[PDB]
């Protein structure tokens, strides 16, 4: 039947989202997208269980498909935040994370019609372009968790190059001094009062400490 073959497409699509959403689950820790993607991962499992429970009944796959498709719009909205909203004020990610929450709720809602799901997907897309016009953070403004995402990635990038180019290559005192700057950068990341400027200088200071250990 043309319904069973269609069922394994969405089942394989839900596995693509399950892998894509667990990757995102780490990067959105402690942000406005932590609970939304946790609800999205749960939505992936309840759709799989529903598809698997009705495997050989051959029924209407319209509502189950609109929920699977809306998960791609959920993922697309999250990657849109990572690439375009890191310099925005807190309200941009707050308002947009609220919209993704409203979308995942409809995906989970058994009473949500296909129209109400598709209408909410457009709400998210319209919300994406709207938060783009939000003001950027001044260099003197307090740093948000999204501002410290670059410092967080720089700490793990310096940790990777340290264990590959410094650990067993240079003397221990070089390893010790570089580990002091990594620990110091973690203190800046954990400081709720550092500015956007102080996060930028800490990235350069840690990068300078890595080239110091690599000379
Ligand atoms: Cl912070």
Curated annotation (Swiss-Prot):
The organism's place on the tree of life at top rank: Bacteria
Main location: secreted
Keyword Repeat: yes
A Pfam family this chain is assigned to: CAMP_factor
Compartments reported by the entry: Secreted
Region (IgG constant region-binding) location: 26-89
MF (Gene Ontology): IgG binding
Sequence repeat boundaries on the chain: 147-157, 158-168, 169-179
One Gene Ontology cellular component annotation held by this UniProt entry: extracellular region
Alphabetically ordered keywords of this record: IgG-binding protein, Repeat, Secreted
Record has Secreted as a keyword: yes
Protein role: Protein B belongs to the group of bacterial Fc-binding protein.
Protein's UniProt name: Protein B
Originating species: Streptococcus agalactiae
């Amino acid at each position: 039947v043309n319904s069973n073959n269609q069922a394994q497409q969405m089942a394989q699509k839900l596995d693509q989202d399950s892998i894509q959403l667990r990757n995102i689950k780490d990067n959105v820790q402690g942000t406005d997208y932590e609970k939304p993607v946790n609800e999205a991962i749960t939505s992936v499992e309840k759709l799989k269980t529903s598809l698997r429970a009705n495997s050989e009944t051959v029924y209407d796959l319209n509502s189950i498909g609109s929920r699977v498709e809306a998960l791609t719009d959920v993922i697309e909205a999250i990657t849109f935040s990572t690439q375009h909203l890191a310099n925005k004020v807190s309200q941009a990610n707050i308002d947009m994370g609220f919209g993704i929450t409203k979308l995942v709720i409809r995906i989970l809602d058994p009473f949500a019609s296909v129209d109400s799901i598709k209408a909410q997907v457009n709400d998210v897309k319209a919300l994406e372009q709207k938060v783009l016009t939000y003001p950027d953070l001044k260099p003197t403004d307090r740093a948000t968790i999204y501002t410290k995402s670059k410092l967080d990635k720089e700490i793990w990038n310096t940790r990777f190059t340290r264990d590959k180019k410094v650990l067993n290559v240079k003397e221990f005192k070089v390893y010790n001094t570089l580990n002091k700057a990594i620990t110091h950068a973690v203190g800046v990341q954990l400081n709720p009062n550092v500015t956007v400027q102080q996060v930028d200088q800490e990235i350069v200071t840690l990068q300078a400490a890595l080239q110091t250990a690599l000379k």
